[PDB]
Every structure is written in C-alpha cells, then in structure tokens.
C-alpha cells in the first residue's frame, strides 16, 4: 500500500486496494431430519433416549412459531 | 375506627366500598395487636396460602365482602382492605373486632 | 423462603435525614419488588413507595419529595430515607415484598411477607 | 465266633454313610443357593446394567449423529429464526464450493470467491422457513461478487486551521472514506465500516454505496478545482484531534494545547508544531494531546498456549483362575469312579 | 462257614467310603473357591460398574433437566451478559404470550403482536442482572406496538440526466427510503434496512425516524411543488447505474457505456436506450452495464434434503438354563434321598 | 444264625453307597457346568459393559476437560472465524485483569477498567488466525480507555411551532444526541445509541465521532447567538410528536390533534394544551396523541421463578448372604471328618 | 403491491403497505435455579456429577463479573 | 442526573455524565490444543471416543476454512 | 415418497376464475418446486408455470397476465387460478415436482413425479 | 403427431431437433393413454430410476436420440422430449408409436 | 519444543537482495514472535528487527529502509529480505523466538530459543 | 571485547552498566565459539530452565551483575547483557572469558 500525504488539505489517501463488490443473491434450500430411532422397551418409563427425543421434539414445536411460514 | 362485637361460633361480615369501580383489585389484612399485618385474601376472591378457610372474599367492583363463617378467639384484630388497581397504594381505615 | 428485617437509629432529632435498611435474606433483591409502609401509633396504614428490579421508582405523592429509595444487592438490602423529619413522622415503619403474579382473573399485585418492624422517634 | 462284634461295626459304618449324606444333602443345598442367586439376582442386576448403557449409548450416539441438525436448530433458537451468518452447520465447505462453481459469473470472480469463501460466508446469512413433522427447512442466501480487481483508495482528513490576527479559519473535508471505481461511476462509502479489508482485498457493502462522478478523484489534487464541487466544511473555532491513517496518523495542535511526538517506555521523543503533521507508524509509537495519549499501532501483549487436560481410558478387565478348580474337579471325577469301582469289588465278593 | 470273605467285604467298602468322602472335601473346596470369588469380586466389579453408570446417567440427566438454565447461561456468556434477541430458552411461547395479553394495547394490537410474535422476539432482547446462589436473574424486554395498519411506501431514485449540447443536467431524489404515516405527521427512515418488511406488513425502529409533515406526499406528483421543499440533489457530471426496485429496477444509461437487458443462459434479449428506464422482474432476469451483469431477482439454485444417521439399540440380554440345573440338582437330592431310605431299611432288615 | 441278613444288610448298604456316589457326579457336572458358565459366558458380558462404560466416561470426560477449546471452535464456527465479544471463554476473568494491568495507562484508568470489565468485553472482540494440528490459534482485541470522567450531557429536541394568522413557522435543532467534553475539542454523537449508559458513565464509540468546537455549548443558552451556527431547521406544515427525554418527555401539540397524558389504568388525568409542554416520568404515566398511546416509562409487568428438575441418584448395590453360607460349608467339613473319624473307628474296631 | 414509474423524476413508489410501530417497553424478571443434586459417596475422587456441578459453579461465578450487579 | 427544560427551543439538556473514551487497542495471543487421549481398543466396531475424536477433527479442519490466513 | 393430487370444480362457466389445488403428501411444499402442465384433448403439453420455496413465480409468456400460482403451507397445497377462461381454455390439468440436484454434467432440472390430473371443461 | 410402427424386438431411434444448441438441457417422457406422463430421461444422458435399462439417452448440443433396443408391448406409448436450458419450458410434439 | 533451521545462498553478489529462510517445526508460526539477529566475523550482536503474528514490523533504525520481513504459514517460514548488499553485510543470521511472558516482576520478554545459523557471504 | 582470566573453582563476577536506569529489562547469554548463543537470564532475576544454579542475576535501574560461584571448565564462552526496555534491542559488547 502507498500512502500520500496531502498538505494541501491537511489529508492523506491510501490506495492499492482491489475491490470484490456484491451483484446478486444465491439461494438454496436445505432439509434436515434426524435419523430413525427405535424404542428400547427394556427400561419402562425413564429412558434417557426417550427423553431426549421428546426434548427434541419440543424444541421443534417452539421452533415452528418463529418460522416464516404460518 | 369503626368497631365490631361478636360472640365464638357467630358469622362476621365486614363491608367496605371503593369510591369507583376497581373489579377484583382488593386485598384483605389481618393485623394483630404488636404485630405486622398478614395477607389474608387477594384478588378480592383468593385464599392466601396458610389462611384458614373459614375467611372468605366476595365482590366485583364497587362492593367487597370479608366473612368469617365460625368465629374463634384467635379471630380478634384488625382487618384493612387495600386496593390495588392503582397508585398511591390505599388501605382502609380499618374495622377493629372486640369480644362480646 | 423470604424473611426480612428492619434496622435503625430508633430516635431522630428534627430536620435530620431519617434511614432505615431492610435486610433480605432467604433470596436475592432482584428477584422481586419491594415496599416500605408507616403505621402511626394508633392509626392506619400508610403506602409510601415501591422500587423495582430495573431501579425505578413510585413514591407516595405526599412523600416524593423527601423520601428516596434505593437497592444494594452486595448486602442484598433495601435502604429508605425521609428527609427533614418533624414529629408528625413518628411511626413504625415496615418493609413487605411486592408479588406480581398470574391469578384467575388476571395480574394482581398483593404485599407478603411483611417485616417485623421497627418504632422511630422524633423529638427533641 | 468273632461275628458278634461285626453288628455294631456294621451299624456305625452305615450311620457314618447316612451322616456323610446328609452333609453332601446340605453341601447341595449350599450350591441350590448359590445357583439360584447367581442366575437371577446377577443376571437380573446384569441385564438392567446393559439396558441403561444401552440407553447411555443411544442418547450419546443420537447427539454425535444429528450434531449438524441440532446445531442448526440451536442456531435459529437463539437467534429467533434467523442466523447472522452462513455457519459451518448450515452448509458444508463442499457444498459452498459447488455452489459457487454454479453462480452465473465468470472464472476470475469464481476462482476469487473460491480464495474468500470466508467472506462470503460472513456476507451471506441464513433463514428459517419452516418445520415439517421432524424436519426443519431453510435458506441460505451467498452473495454474487460481480466486479473484482478494480481499484479503490480511502480518505481521512483532520481540521486545517489558520490563524492571522488571532482569528482562525479552520478547513475540514467531508470526503471521508472508502472510494473504488465501477462502471458508469465510482462508489462512495462515507462510514470506514462500510468496506471490509482483508488482506489487500476490500469487500464492501451494497446498502452503504452511493454512487457519485469519476471526476471526484480531482478533490485529491485541487480542493479549489471549479471541475468539481469538493465537499468542505468551514469553521471559526480551532479544534485539536490525531486522525488515525491506515499507515500512520495526522495531528493537529493550535492555541493552547501541549501536543508531543513519544514512545510507551522511554516516554517524549520530540515535540510537534502547531498545525497538521503527519506521523507514520514506523516514526514512534504515541501521540500525547495535553494529558491524553493516543496509540499509533495495537499493543502487542502477552502470548498464551493453554492445554487442555489429558482423557485416560480405565479398562480394567476381569480373570479368573479355573486351573486349580480343573484340578479338583478331576481329582474329584476320578475318586468318585475309584469309589464307585472298589464297592464294585465289595458286592462282588459276596457271592 | 466263609465268613472271612465279609469280614474284607466291609473293610473295602469302608475305604471306598474313605474315598467318597475325600472327593467330596475336594468339591467343597472347589466350590468355596469359585463360591469366594463370585460373592467378593464379581460384586465388586459389578457393583463398581453400578456407580458408574449412576454417575454418567446423572451427569446426561442433570443436563437434560437444567437444559434451559445452561442455555440462557451459555447465552449470557457468549454475548457478555447481553443478548442479541428473546431467544426461545429466555421466554417460552406460552410465556410471551401471556405478556402479549397483558399489555397495555387493544384487541387489534394484541392480535397482531400474537401473529408476529417472531419479529416480537427478534425486536425485543434480555439483559443478565445478576447472579445469586445457584441462580441466574435476568430481564427480558418486549416491545410493544401500540401503532398498526397505517399505509407505508417505499421511494427509490435513479439519476435523471438530460444533454444538452454535451452539457448535462443531472437530477436524483434525496426522498428515497421508507414512509408510514402516524398521526401528526409520517415518520421517515431514510435507510432500507431501518425497516423490515414481513407479509404486507413493515416493522419499523423507532430510533431510525425522522418525523416529517403529511405534505411530503405531494413529492410524488410534481417534483417541484411550492407547497413542499422536495429535497433533490443537482449534478453536472453524469452517473450510470442500476437501482433494484422491490417489484423491478431502474436502469440509468448515459455518455459512453452499454446498457442492455439479459436473461441469462440465452443472453441478450435488446439493447437499452439511453436515459431513464423501468424494467419489471417478469420482463428479464439481468441487467448488464458495460461488462457488469447485476441480477434482478434471486437466483434459485439447488435443493439439498440431508437427513441424520440413523441409532439403534445394542441391547442383548444374558438368559441362564435353569431347568438343566434343577433337573440335575433334583436327580442328586433324589439320590440322597434314596441312600438314606436303603441305609434305613438296611438297619431295619438287619434284625430279626 | 443270620449270616444271610447281615449279607443282604451289606448289599443294600453298597448299592446305597454306590447310589449317593452316583449323585454326587451328578452335582459335581452340575457345578462344573455352573463354573464354565459363570467363568466364560458371564465374564465375557463384564468385560463388554466395562469397555462400553470407559468409552461413555471418556466421552463425557473428553467433553468435560476439553470445554473452553470446544466452546471456542463453536463460537468460531457459528460467527464464521469471528467472535462478536471477548466471551468468557476466549478470555477468563483473570487474564482479563492482568491484561487490563498491563495496559499502558494510569492507575484512574485501569481502576475503572475493572470496575466495568463488561464493557470491556463488549467492546473488545476476538479474531481466528489459523489450525495447526490439533489446535486453534486466535487473537483477542481489548480496548484501552485513556480519557475518564469528564462532563457528558444530552440533547433532545421537538418542534417548536408558532402560529400567526393560521401561517405556521416550526423549528428544529439538529444538535441531538450525546456530547463529551475532550482535551482541544468536544466529541459529537448524532445518534443516541453511540454511547453506551451504564450508572453515570457514558461509554462512546470512537468511530462515530465528530470532533467539534468547544463553543458548541452555548447552543443551550441563546440559539440566536452569532458567536456560533447553531444547528437549527425551519418548516412550515406543524408536526405532532412526542420525544422521550431520560427522565421525561416533551410533546408537541399542534392544529388539529388532541394530546392528553394519563395513566394505564385510569383515562384522562389532564389535557395538555398547544404547543410544547415537558413532562417529568414522575407526573404520569402515558402520553396519548389522538388515539396513539405513548409509554413514558418501562411497563413492569410480571415476575418469574422457574426451578428446574432434581437429579437423584439410582446406586442399588448388590450383596450376598454370605454367613449361611460359611455355617453351611462349616458343617459340611466338619461333619465329612465325622463321618472319617468313625468310619476309622469301626475299622479299629474291626479286629 | 402495486408499483408506479414516475418518469417525471426517474423514481418509482411501491405501495401496499401496513404500518407496525412500536410505542413501549414492556418487562418481565425471571429466576432460574439449578435443580438439587445429591451426593454420590460411592465414587473414587473425580466424580463426573460432580465435575459437572464444579464446572456449572465455576461458569456461574465468571458470570458474575458480567452482570449489571455492581 | 439533572435535566433541565430549554423552553426557549422546545428542548431539554440532561447532565451529570461521566465519560470512558477508547484510545487504543490491546492485544493478546492464544493457543488452545486438545488434550491427549488414548486407544480404547476392547472395543468391537466404532468407538463413541473414537467418533467424538473425528467430530472434533473435521470440525477443524472445516474451521481451518475460515481462518485469516489462507 | 412425495405423491401428489389435483382436486377442481370439472365444469366451469365462460368467463369466470378456474381455480385448481393440488394436494402434497409424504413431504414439505417448501422443500422442492413445483409446476403446472394441461394437455389439451388430442394435443401436447403445455407448460404453464414454476413457484419457487420463497415464492417467486416464472409464468408462461402465453398466460402471464391470467394466472397466479401460490403456496399455503397450513394445508400443504399448491393453488392455481386462471382468469377469463374460454373453450380455449379446456384441457387436462397437472401437477408435479420441479427436482433441481447435481448431475454428471452440472446443475439440471427435471419433472418428476408428476400428478394423475384432473379434467376441466369450459362451456356455457 | 409423427408416428412410427415397428414390430417386437426391433429397435427403434426416435430424433428431435433443437433450434438451438443447449448442450445437454434435454429430457424424455413416456405417456400412455389415459395417464400421466413418466419422465424416462433427464439431462440427455441420465436414466431415471425404475426405467428398463432398454432405454438410452444420447446427444449434445442440438440432435439428441432416444434409442429402444429390444420392444415388449408395454413400450407403445407417446413420447416428447423438452428442454431445461430455458424458460418457457418447450415440450415436442410427440412421437406416437403405433404397433405394427 | 519448536525448533528453528536456516538456509540461504551463502554467497551473494554485491547490489543484490539477500534472501533468508527460517523454518519452524514443532509449532507454528502464529503462537509467537521471531526476530533475526547477525553477528559479524569477531564482532558482537546486531538486533535486525522483530515480527508479530498479526504481520507487525519493528526493525532496527540502522536497517529499516533495506529489510523486509514476513509470515508463510502454508509451509511455516519466516523470511528476511536485504536489499542492496554490500561486503559491510557479511555476517552470520540467526533466527530466533521472541517470548513473552509474566515474570515475577512483571510482562518482559527474551529470545529463546535460537537456529543455529548460516554464513552469508558478499563479493565481487 | 573486554577479556577476563581465572582458574577452575574461582568466582567470576562479570558486570556492565546501563545508559538510563531500565529496572528489571535486562538479559544474560552465553555463546560458545561456533555456536549460537544460549539465553542464561531473563528479566535480570530469572534464571533459565537448563541452565546450572551456578549462574545467578542480581540489580535493578542502571547496575546489574552475572557471578559463577564455582568455575568449570565448560563456563569458558562470551557472555552479554541485552537490555529488552525498549526497541531496537541492544547487546552488550561481550566479555570473553578465558582460561589461566
Ligand atoms: C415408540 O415410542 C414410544 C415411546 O417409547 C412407544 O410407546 C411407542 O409405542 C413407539 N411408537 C412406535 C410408532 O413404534
Ligand atoms: C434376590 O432376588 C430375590 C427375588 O425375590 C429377592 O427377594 C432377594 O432379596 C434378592 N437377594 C439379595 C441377597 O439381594
Ligand atoms: C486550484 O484551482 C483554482 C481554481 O481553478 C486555481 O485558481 C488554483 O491556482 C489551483 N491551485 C493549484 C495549486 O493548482
Ligand atoms: C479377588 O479379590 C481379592 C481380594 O478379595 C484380590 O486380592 C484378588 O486379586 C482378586 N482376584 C482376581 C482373580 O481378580
Ligand atoms: C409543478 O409545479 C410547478 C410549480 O408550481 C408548476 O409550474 C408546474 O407547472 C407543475 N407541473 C405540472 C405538470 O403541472
Ligand atoms: C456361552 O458361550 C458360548 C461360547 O463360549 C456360546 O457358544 C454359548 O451359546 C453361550 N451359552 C449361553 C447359554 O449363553
Ligand atoms: C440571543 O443572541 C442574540 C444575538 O446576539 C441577541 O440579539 C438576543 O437578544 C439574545 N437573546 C437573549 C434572550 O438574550
Ligand atoms: C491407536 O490404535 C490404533 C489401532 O487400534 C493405531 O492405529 C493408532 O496409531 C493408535 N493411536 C495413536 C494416537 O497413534
């Protein structure tokens, strides 16, 4: 970089740089699932997989209502 | 302040009246002699939590109700209704009860 | 549980500047809203002001223009003070909590628990 | 004859076989117990070990696998549907690569967008669209980098006072900021923060542009030019301030204020005149206006290399030795059958 | 008289019982080994293991349970006790609902704002207090719109030149950026960004408004009204550029450059005239200025469908043969039982 | 007389002896079955659920010891090489301190810096610079506070309209926002939200300032001062607004429009007249303009608890009765030697 | 949306619009504690739980130097 | 604070403010590694330390995109 | 899989405002693109339109100005609506899947799967 | 619409022309009577999934082939090729095959 | 631990440009500071200058317009670059760590450790 | 270079002296010939890690000082002080040790 200092104007000027400007937008969509999961029937009641999804499963439904789409 | 006399075992009840309309924003105070005062209802309708059931409150609006339904020697006090539909927060002048 | 206690010098002379401090204990200042309220000897009971969470403030407005209140949460206490006392302000003087909650009809605003108290004097 | 003193040895011999009996009956009692708390209790205590690490297993196992869409989901949580940046969970190098390889440009904005991936990944951002059963759905939306390679230069000015007869006339620039050359026009962006520089590159911001005349370049030149009208602020009132420069720094030092020229440890290196004077950070260090002192360059300060803790495996595997039980068992198989043989011969006799 | 055959007869079968009893000693001290080892250290490991497992299975659930206390934790931490918007572990939907209803608004407000709630949270935002004990205390800040359904529009400007001569004459609105009208007066945001629009609806910032009079409507019609200053700047140099438009685009064209209207994969579809133009997102897809292209729309790409690894169970439980042990076991105390009748009946029969 | 009993006796007690012998290599296969099962197809179902807990443990541990790099390369990763802040992560408290100790300033400045360590934070922000093996190297940018305590104040305004025969002349200042007071010169703010509040000290931002004249002050005594252009806007059509101020409000009441402040939850307290009038937080609550209603203050509303879910443990140790056993085995022993001792003496006896 | 040209100035206005203005703040206050937890005696020195609670205490304390709580 | 009405231009002036103005900038450097971690090789197929181990090195590796130097 | 189908009044009046709906199940109209092709008795295929998951719409230069195309993801269905219909205007109505994915080649586009139709008759 | 005849087992070429290149933005469909048509060939060279392997794709630029190599009586159908290169998507006019 | 190797021409022609390589193994380049150090046949130590791994320079006053420094991190180098090499300039290079750290007393820095070195020479 | 005798076991107290007082920014190396020197003491207190106890630092300001209590025939190197106050770093002119 070259900087010139402008005693005229009590200023400088830095030049030496290449531009990248922004033309347009590029979209995808994208799709996420989680994998299949099976019941593990040994344990009745308090599975820690079990809670999990349902943990998953609620955070999805809170995530429903900030979607962009009604 | 007004003054109340009443026997054990006799139904109690106490009237007090808003100047305007405040729907069910009152409370209701029990306060004992070299005590502090103890919430007895809100809402003009609530029980609060460890207050005996025989208290009861009544009343939208203008018009509220505090009745005792079985009187008891502990019973005797001090009894204030406060409205809190708006500030300045303002009590009651007060209905005193004393033993027959 | 929230249990509160209130301390002071107990005698004023006139035309000081009255304090009192509420100590909160058994939770944090922050948590709630907090009241003080003055009862004369024979007399009923007078609403003085509520403080917030935020800091802000509502005083009684026959007493804004001597009383300020403010929150300490290193101490985690609540400190009142009236000045220019005269004998008409001897009273004894209660700190209580502000509950604001969700009740069947709506928001309601009631004053639990309430402090034990403390007697203030003016005289000369 | 000698047979009457063979009853009673007879006797106690088939009472010592009966009481030997009974010992093996509760030695076999003692095993029914041990059998029978070693198939249920152990097994039972077992079996429930190896379900509850199998559902330590699976919940460990769901969160390694869905990692990508939980931290997405983690993402749009906190941010209320919609991510600041394209995050490495919302799309994978590979994925932006081939992307840009489909963008309707030419091969030198590719290969540079290919170079600054990093850019265009803090110039994108994402959104959440919706959730379809456990499923959620989202855009992301990369920047296009049209024009590359052209050139751009950035202004700074500082107040230029004069003074004669005690009254001073201050002149200020208003061109301040980043300026690079288009088509048609030359872009202008008035905030330093409009343009992002890395490297020798410098990215800027759409939104901020403002397109103005190729013959603002003439402001550089001639403030008094009549080919253009440069933008310049007059004032009466002196005012001192060091205007920071990309490489250096302009000072401005009028009526009373003690401006000097100085380093962090030895202190003062030289005094500055009153007016402007440009500093270059190759020069010295600070520069002190009155009481306040102002740094040319960033501080470098201490470096650190923190480790981590080491994890240890604590496998600890289980033996036992059945050499010596092997021996007895055999030991045992062969004297029952010798017993057995030798009473054989005893019931043999007797013919 | 071979009575001396029997007195060898019982002495042999004495020394088989010497026999027996020995093998059996072995046993039993064979199965007090694998008794000892069992009880001290198969239970041992066993129990071991069991706390083991205990403490992983309260680690995962201590998270799984305090899972919104470390999320809002985690926040806090990340932005140094500020964050960015009401995230959904700060307030739960059912909670800013409940504080929707109770605000100090109409039905209408209401309505809307429970419509919206996403650019309720996204408007509003929580700072940390403080800490005490194992707790956290936090104040969450919602915003409350009080104005809505009033008419907003949007102003975008191109330069506007005019030759003469080679002497140009540019002119370009200074109007440009987001109008909603208030009571009083229209509230004016001269950036883009200051408001956002989601639907037909515009949620606009407060601290970006510059409220102006309802006379500033007449800019629309005739550019030089006396009734209102319209705020234009003049130039003499011309300016070549596109400006995108929420529906289209206005494309200036000037002096030496080519401007001309494309469509991408097939490429030019007719050269632009010099001066002012509108072209409309179904006209074309791209404008291209000398050799810069500039999109009028978004470019839809590819369509990615990801789903997860699946996870299965590893359960596989242990069954022990019981009834081969108990038949045996059976058979052996059947057989103790059995000696002891014969030795019985032995004893019986050995009287007269 | 009965040498033929005494023969059948021995038959019958032989074929007893050889029966219990024939149990007791029954039981001996039935405990040799027991031991191979419990040695191998036992043992092995032990080993596996140790090296599965060991793997839990060390995922767990490895997550758990590894966590500040591990929330470093996720904050890294979610803002795309850049971190917003100086998080507690990319920095602990102590470095913090000791970094503020080592800054080149004075002991007021570095004071203040550790009394408002969170602004320092959130003015400071983190960079990534590069991946060499296994780690992640970044640098962390702090900011130095030179300049402390001196005067700052703020400046809102509203129309100020005036009626002559219906002909409306409104004015506007245009100084709003926030000053401090600097060595040669005063700093200019345009917009509120460039300083920062907290208690009583402003925290400003360095690139939105505008250094000015000290002389700006008088603007608050005379705006019709001609020792200094105020900034000042005409019109002509009347505006109606309300401007929130710190600790009040000013209205503007023009033409035709009604304002009135009241409270929430009752109407009108007073009706305010023409013009501007100030209103202190104090005095009431809203403000209302024809039918909009503005909030003077924050509405505190409700006030909530939430305690999560205890966590209890599930350790259920196992035992064995471990004495019956030993008095079973204790008298199997001793009454086998019984049963030998006897036997011995019926052999002795034997003669 | 409906969009006009506006040749008479090289401008267009796309009206169409629906105004949402905010007039207030409205506040909450929340509290959130970490369940109770039990010992577990039966461990060897390094708990996981117990590394686990050591490490949400040590956070909460860094956290403590954040806040608004002077 | 002390705010004062200026009813002679309809504005009000609020004093009692103390400043903290930035001067420079202060810089530090770190390096955080991964502690070191071991075979657990009585495992039959994948590990979830093996798996965690992988995670944590394309999680690198898709940083080391993003980094400042190239 | 995704299957889809077309549900439609049969018999619509000259002049009036035809309006089809095609019905997604197995999957999420904001995952993919989706299009609309009639084939007139005895004739070809005529493409009509594409909307995108952001909801941008191509349209048929020959039925631009007579066709709109949304998407309503509470029900998960694709609208079509053609104004002024004529007899011209008689046709078979699809529905079907715009797939865009990578190919050995680049960046194509297909049809698939498509909807069984439903017949639309204009008459008076 | 062109027809074409042949018999079982023959193998049959049907070409479509494009009026301009478009490399390989070309599909193939198969409709038989009363349904819907079945894409059998995307990008000119790619065999949708469920296709009989008899069918191929070929060509680049402007001539493209679809090519039979052994017909079974389930192939009689009507069958257009369209371009992907650009909007308005463009169907042919239909081959009809006829049996002979 | 890291260590540090250097290698150059060995022999350069006058008004040329001298051009040294420091390559680091063991660490990289970013965690720390490195400077050059030359030490003349029978004289003493010459500090060159020192760079930072933000890409800072400070170069030592007597060899500022002639030197230039820098970071490769693809192959984890250090460069030095002199221009205008005169027999003045024969002397053998040294690369080294600039460490900085707290000491008991405070934040100081050394050298440590150092490459072991590489003679260039100059001449006609 | 100032040059210094002395005999196996001896102590060596080897001193130079600042321009301006620099505190505790001091540093000690040892080079041996054909070698690259070796950092001794840092901050002009600190003893290295590796180096032997043998060597000690002492002074603050403007004197500072470097003693061998017990001499070994390894010690025989050149030895300088190199003040890190401020940049550009200056080396001290060296004191070859040499033996009786
Ligand atoms: C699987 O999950 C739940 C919860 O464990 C179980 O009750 C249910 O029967 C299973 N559902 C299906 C669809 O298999
Ligand atoms: C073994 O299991 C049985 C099943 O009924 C249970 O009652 C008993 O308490 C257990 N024994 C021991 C020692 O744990
Ligand atoms: C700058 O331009 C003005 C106006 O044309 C001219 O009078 C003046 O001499 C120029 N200055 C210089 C230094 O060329
Ligand atoms: C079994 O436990 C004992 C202590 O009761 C211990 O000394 C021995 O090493 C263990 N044996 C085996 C084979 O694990
Ligand atoms: C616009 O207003 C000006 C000023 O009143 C007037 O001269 C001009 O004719 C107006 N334009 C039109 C098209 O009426
Ligand atoms: C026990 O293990 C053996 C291998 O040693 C296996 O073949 C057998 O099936 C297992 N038996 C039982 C009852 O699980
Ligand atoms: C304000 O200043 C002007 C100009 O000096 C003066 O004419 C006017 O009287 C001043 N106003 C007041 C109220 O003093
Ligand atoms: C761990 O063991 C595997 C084989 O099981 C081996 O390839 C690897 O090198 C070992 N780990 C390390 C860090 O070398």
Redesign the interface.
């Known amino acids: 970089?070259k900087?010139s200092?402008?005693?005229?104007?009590?200023?400088?000027?830095?030049?030496?740089?290449?531009?990248?400007?922004?033309?347009?937008?590029?979209?995808?969509?994208?799709?996420?699932?989680?994998?299949?999961?099976?019941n593990?029937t040994?344990?009745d009641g308090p599975?820690?997989?079990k809670?999990?999804?349902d943990?998953?499963?609620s955070?999805?439904?809170?995530?429903?209502?900030?979607?962009?789409?009604? | 302040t007004p003054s109340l006399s009443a026997s054990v075992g006799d139904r109690v009840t106490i009237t007090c009246r808003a100047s305007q309309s405040i729907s069910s924003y009152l409370n209701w105070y029990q306060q004992k002699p070299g005590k502090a005062p103890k919430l007895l209802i809100y809402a003009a309708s609530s029980l609060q939590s460890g207050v005996p059931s025989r208290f009861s409150g009544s009343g939208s609006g203008t018009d509220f109700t505090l009745t005792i339904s079985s009187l008891q020697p502990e019973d005797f006090a001090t009894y204030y209704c406060q409205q809190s539909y708006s500030t300045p927060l303002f009590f009651g002048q007060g209905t005193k009860l004393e033993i027959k | 549980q929230v249990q509160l206690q209130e301390s002071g010098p107990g005698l004023v002379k006139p035309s000081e500047t009255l304090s009192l401090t509420c100590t909160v204990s058994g939770g944090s200042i922050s948590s709630y809203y907090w009241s003080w309220i003055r009862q004369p000897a024979g007399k009923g009971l007078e609403w003085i002001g509520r403080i917030y969470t935020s800091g802000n403030t509502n005083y009684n407005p026959s007493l804004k223009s001597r009383v300020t209140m403010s929150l300490d949460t290193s101490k985690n206490q609540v400190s009142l003070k009236l000045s220019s006392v005269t004998a008409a302000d001897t009273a004894v003087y209660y700190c209580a909590r502000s509950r604001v909650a969700t009740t069947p009809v709506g928001l309601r605003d009631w004053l639990d628990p309430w402090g034990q108290g403390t007697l203030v004097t003016v005289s000369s």
């Open positions: 970089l900087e200092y402008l005693e005229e104007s009590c200023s400088t000027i830095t030049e030496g740089y290449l531009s990248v400007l922004r033309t347009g937008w590029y979209t995808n969509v994208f799709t996420l699932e989680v994998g299949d999961v099976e593990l040994c344990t599975s820690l997989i809670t999990e999804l943990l998953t499963k955070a999805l439904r809170e995530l429903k209502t900030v979607s962009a789409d009604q």
